[PDB]
RNA sequence: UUCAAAUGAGAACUUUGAAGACUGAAGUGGGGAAAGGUUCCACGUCAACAGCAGUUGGACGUGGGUUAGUCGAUCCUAAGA
RNA sequence: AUAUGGAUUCUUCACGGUAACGUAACUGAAUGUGGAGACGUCGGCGCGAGCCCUGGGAGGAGUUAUCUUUUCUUCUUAACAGCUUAUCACCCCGGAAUUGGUUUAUCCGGAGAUGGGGUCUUAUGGCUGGAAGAGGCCAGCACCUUUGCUGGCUCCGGUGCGCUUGUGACGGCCCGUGAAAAUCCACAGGAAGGAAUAGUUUUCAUGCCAGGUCGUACUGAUAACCGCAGCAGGUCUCCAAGGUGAACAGCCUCUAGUUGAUAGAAUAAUGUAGAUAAGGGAAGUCGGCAAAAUAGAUCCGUAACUUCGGGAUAAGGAUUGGCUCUAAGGGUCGGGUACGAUCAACUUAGAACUGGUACGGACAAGGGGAAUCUGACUGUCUAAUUAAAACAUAGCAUUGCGAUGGUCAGAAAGUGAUGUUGACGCAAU
């Protein structure tokens, strides 16, 4: 790191954006069935292999 | 006691990453990076640093007036005077003995 | 980056086309071994270098400043 | 090449609050100012007095304003007067004794 | 390791002050390369997690942050591809 | 992109210097050539830088029963630019035996020494500009406030087998001689172009516009990486203060940084880790395993045997604190064409005195000897039960081969390794 290719920074960015809790208003929709965000990731529990 | 870090990202001691310690107006020590030293141009004949000529790293020679790149005799910045002394002498003497060979071997052709 | 001593040359700088601003600095300084004296550095900001001319003789200094172009934007102190 | 030097102390501020005695004070100088290593040796080489409201040291020998400060700190220390009185520089070589 | 204050429902463990020590510049200091990828910083904050604890955190929530004509890449060639 | 100034020209493409070479400039196509880029390693010697030590002075701080003109701390100067600055090298004068000059290190001179005069590179340093207006250190007023405001001082020195790093002129080594290319400059050349009623010149000065794209946070580890983890493991590097001491050792300290790691009470057995033990002294045990003993430095003394290099710190001995003295070892100046005067350094040896005979006082720090077996040696391996006598090695000897070739690769081939090779070679034992 510390000096990255733009491709990697890009992925990096896309993966920051995905790292948020479920938006609670979805829980209210007719037939909604998603309890929580089941694809959450943490930097010190699962490495993202680039 | 005041220690000091590199300034560019390269952490290794390579010939392109020499450092100089320096005392700033802030009253502190700071590293400065240091360009590799320039070497003296050399005579094309004999090989010694030729005198009268500035010494810079190569691209720096295009930011410098032509007087910094010569002395004012024949083959100025190129070969070294003593070497040009030799060049002249030998040139003369040889062109001379050419005339000698011509007329000697010419006479061969007239008595043989 | 330049120092200048020819008080004639100096003037000619300050009337150059590119010269919009200037500045006069004053320092206390001491002379020889004993007493003090009032040093004055005349700085002309040229386009690519700052010319500065030092007049130790405080006398020369005054009737220099009144020579300064009435159009030059001088910075006093 | 010999050089004489002047040192003033403005002892007004704490003299005027009763707690300072310019008297025995300039005596303290008189008594402990070491000259080539010894007390009371300042034989016509260092003169000391008290213009009523101001003490004055005049020296021809090894003497620094740092030393002066070191002495009267010991005085002020001697007579319980620290907490209350600072030796201080105002202009160079002209010193005062601040109260509060 | 210790005393006390502060905070907090709650303090062996947080914060601040004080004291006692340690690393001892071949560092428990000050920076970087690979690798990580936001962990940086701020505010909020303890259900899980940090094999006692927790008011603290590299945890959780919400935000902010990475400025170049000169520093690197970019150009050149090396083994090689 | 370009004008203005300068320079140059009626002797068109500058002058000056005997010369080394000088400079603000001082046309130069094809082509050719030269230089830079560009290069190992270790040794001592010389200089730089920053750090270390330190005197005076001007400030602030600490200690002050007593003592200390004291202890601690601030006193700084960037890139860049002008001038100046150098070991080396080179030039001119000169013509050398009574050979001289000369490095710590023995090299140099009739292929021109020593001497005297000069030319050069600008590493590096100095002075000035940048620049005191910055930053650093203080004091004196102001007041919930943004937070000000006002004054000062920021000076002059010293020392060196110091420490780190830099660089130079040298020297050692090699069957080892220690990259490439982009890129920049120069020279040889002289195609060509170019003035007097006015031309040539942007490698001299000044002036104008522009410089995109991506990275840039933080960690870098007894918690930001790899080991299923906040794992006593593993993971490339730069900076580096004071004392003791040979020392980047150990031990203590400043700057910075920590004070993390469940906690309380007790101190049974048996443990793990750290020590001691009378008299004896390996009787223990497969086996001195473990442990103990030794250790620095100075001096003295030192066997067999040997490839003469060793063996060797062989072995064996004395000595070492504190304090007070003595003696030897240097620099710098002026001397008509013998000495004087001053400033600055820890080494070494001698001599007193002194103590519960201690003194490398902690730390640090070799047990020695006589033989047999075995491998010559240094080196190498079974990551995770074998480090050895095993492997390697130099040395010795044997084999194959002159290219239409030897040995080896490939399914094939206008295929490939040795081969940038040639028997002082390559290949195989
Ligand atoms: Mg991990
Ligand atoms: Mg950096
Ligand atoms: Mg020249
Ligand atoms: Mg030159
Ligand atoms: Mg605790
Ligand atoms: Mg310690
Ligand atoms: Mg150490
Ligand atoms: Mg730690
Ligand atoms: Mg970092
Ligand atoms: Mg990471
Ligand atoms: Mg944080
Ligand atoms: Mg809880
Ligand atoms: Mg956790
Ligand atoms: Mg827990
Ligand atoms: Mg809990
Ligand atoms: Mg968060
Ligand atoms: Mg966020
Ligand atoms: Mg660059
Ligand atoms: Mg590019
Ligand atoms: Mg001219
Ligand atoms: Mg070429
Ligand atoms: Mg070449
Ligand atoms: Mg190279
Ligand atoms: Mg210091
Ligand atoms: Mg630079
Ligand atoms: Mg000479
Ligand atoms: Mg001459
Ligand atoms: Mg090094
Ligand atoms: Mg060589
Ligand atoms: Mg050149
Ligand atoms: Mg023709
Ligand atoms: Mg130009
Ligand atoms: Mg383009
Ligand atoms: Mg950074
Ligand atoms: Mg960490
Ligand atoms: Mg995993
Ligand atoms: Mg670990
Ligand atoms: Mg840290
Ligand atoms: Mg534990
Ligand atoms: Mg316990
Ligand atoms: Mg016993
Ligand atoms: Mg015995
Ligand atoms: Mg037995
Ligand atoms: Mg026995
Ligand atoms: Mg038995
Ligand atoms: Mg046995
Ligand atoms: Mg037996
Ligand atoms: Mg043993
Ligand atoms: Mg014993
Ligand atoms: Mg023996
Ligand atoms: Mg003795
Ligand atoms: Mg002596
Ligand atoms: Mg062996
Ligand atoms: Mg061995
Ligand atoms: Mg094994
Ligand atoms: Mg196996
Ligand atoms: Mg072994
Ligand atoms: Mg043999
Ligand atoms: Mg074919």
Q: How far is CA D41 from CA C9, C56, D49, D60, in A?
A: 64, 47, 16, 13
CB count within 10 Å of CB C72 equals 14
Nucleotide F188, nearest residue via CA and C1': B75
Copy the structure tokens of residue B56.
């810079």
Q: Where are the alpha helices (DSSP H) in chain B?
A: 82-108
HSE of D79, CA atoms in CB hemisphere, 13 A = 15
Angle of helix D22-32 relative to helix D65-78, nearest 10 degrees, comes to: 120
User: Are the C-beta atoms of D76 and D82 separated by less than 8 Å?
Assistant: yes
Distance in angstroms (rounded) separating the CA atoms of residues D88 and D98: 7
Chains in touch with B (3+ beta-carbon pairs under 8 Å) read none
Copy the structure tokens of residue C16.
């150059």
Give buried/exposed letters for B51-86 (b at 16+ CB in 10 A, else e): eebbebeeeeeeeeeeeebeeeeebbbbbbbebbee
Beta pairing partners, C73: C21
Q: Which nucleotide is nearest to A49 (CA to C1')?
A: E36
Contacts of B77 (CB under 8 A, 6+ apart): B41, B50, B52, B53, B69, B70, B71
Determination technique used:
X-ray
Beta pairing partners, C74: C22
DSSP B57: -
- Give the E-state strand segments of chain C in sequence order: 2-4, 21-30, 36-45, 50-55, 73-76
Distance in angstroms (rounded) separating the CA atoms of residues D73 and D89: 13
The residue with tokens 């007087």 is B67
Nearest to A18 by CA among B20, A7, A43: A43
User: Are the C-beta atoms of A31 and A48 separated by less than 8 Å?
Assistant: no
Distance in angstroms (rounded) separating the CA atoms of residues D56 and A4: 72
End-to-end CA distance of chain B: 95
A38 contact to strand E (CB, 7 A limit): no
Give the three-state DSSP class for C42: strand
Contacts of B62 (CB under 8 A, 6+ apart): none
CA D65 to chain centre: 9
Distance in angstroms (rounded) separating the CA atoms of residues A32 and B43: 87
B10 contact to strand E (CB, 7 A limit): yes
Copy the structure tokens of residue D14.
């704490």
Tell me, in Å, how far CA of A30 is from C1' of F26? Answer: 92
Give the three-state DSSP class for A47: coil
Beta pairing partners, D96: D10, D88
Tell me, in Å, how far CA of C6 is from C1' of F318? Answer: 83
Give buried/exposed letters for B4-18 (b at 16+ CB in 10 A, else e): eeeeeeeeeeeeeee
Q: Chain A, 17-36: which CBs lie within 7 Å of strand F?
A: none
D88 contact to strand F (CB, 7 A limit): yes
Report the helix count and the strand count for chain C, using DSSP H and E: 2, 5
Q: How far is CA C77 from CA B83, B93, C22, C43, C73, in A?
A: 60, 74, 10, 11, 13
Give the three-state DSSP class for B106: helix
HSE of B96, CA atoms in CB hemisphere, 13 A = 6
Copy the structure tokens of residue A21.
């809790």
Tell me, in Å, how far CA of D21 is from C1' of F292? Answer: 75
Tell me, in Å, how far CA of D12 is from C1' of F108? Answer: 82
Distance in angstroms (rounded) separating the CA atoms of residues D69 and D66: 5
A17 contact to strand E (CB, 7 A limit): no
Beta pairing partners, D34: D39
User: Are the C-beta atoms of B29 and B42 separated by less than 8 Å?
Assistant: no
- Give the E-state strand segments of chain B in sequence order: 18-23, 29-34
B112 contact to strand F (CB, 7 A limit): no
Strand order across the beta sheet in which C73-76 lies: C2-4, C50-55, C36-45, C21-30, C73-76
The residue with tokens 């150059």 is C16
């Amino acid at each position: 790191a510390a000096q990255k290719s733009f491709r990697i920074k890009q992925k990096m960015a896309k993966a920051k954006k995905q790292n948020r809790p479920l938006p609670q208003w979805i829980r209210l929709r007719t037939n909604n069935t998603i309890r929580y965000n089941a694809k959450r990731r943490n930097w010190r529990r699962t490495k993202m292999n680039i | 006691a005041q220690r000091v870090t590199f300034r560019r990202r390269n952490p290794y001691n390579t010939r392109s990453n020499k450092i100089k310690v320096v005392k700033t107006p802030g009253g502190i020590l700071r590293a400065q990076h240091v360009k590799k030293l320039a070497t003296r141009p050399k005579c094309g004949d004999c090989g010694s640093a030729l005198q009268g000529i500035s010494t810079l790293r190569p691209r720096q020679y295009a930011t410098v007036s032509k007087t910094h790149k010569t002395v004012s005799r024949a083959y100025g910045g190129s070969r070294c005077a003593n070497c040009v002394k030799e060049r002249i002498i030998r040139a003369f003497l040889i062109e001379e003995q050419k005339i000698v060979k011509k007329v000697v071997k010419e006479q061969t052709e007239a008595a043989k | 980056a330049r120092e200048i001593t020819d008080i004639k040359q100096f003037l000619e700088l300050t009337r150059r086309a590119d010269v919009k601003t200037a500045t006069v600095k004053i320092n206390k300084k001491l002379n020889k071994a004993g007493k003090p004296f009032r040093q004055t550095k005349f700085k002309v900001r040229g386009s690519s270098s700052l010319y500065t001319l030092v007049i130790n003789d405080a006398g020369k200094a005054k009737k220099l400043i009144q020579s300064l172009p009435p159009t030059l934007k001088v910075n006093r102190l | 090449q010999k050089i004489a030097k002047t040192f003033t102390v403005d002892v007004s501020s704490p003299t005027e609050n009763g707690v300072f005695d310019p008297a025995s004070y300039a005596k303290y100088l008189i008594d402990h100012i070491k000259v080539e290593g010894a007390v009371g040796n300042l034989g016509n080489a260092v003169t000391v007095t008290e213009d009523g409201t101001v003490v004055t040291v005049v020296s021809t020998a090894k003497f620094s304003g740092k030393y002066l400060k070191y002495l009267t700190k010991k005085y002020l220390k001697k007579n319980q007067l620290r907490d209350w009185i600072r030796f201080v520089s105002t202009k160079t070589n002209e010193y005062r004794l601040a109260f509060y």
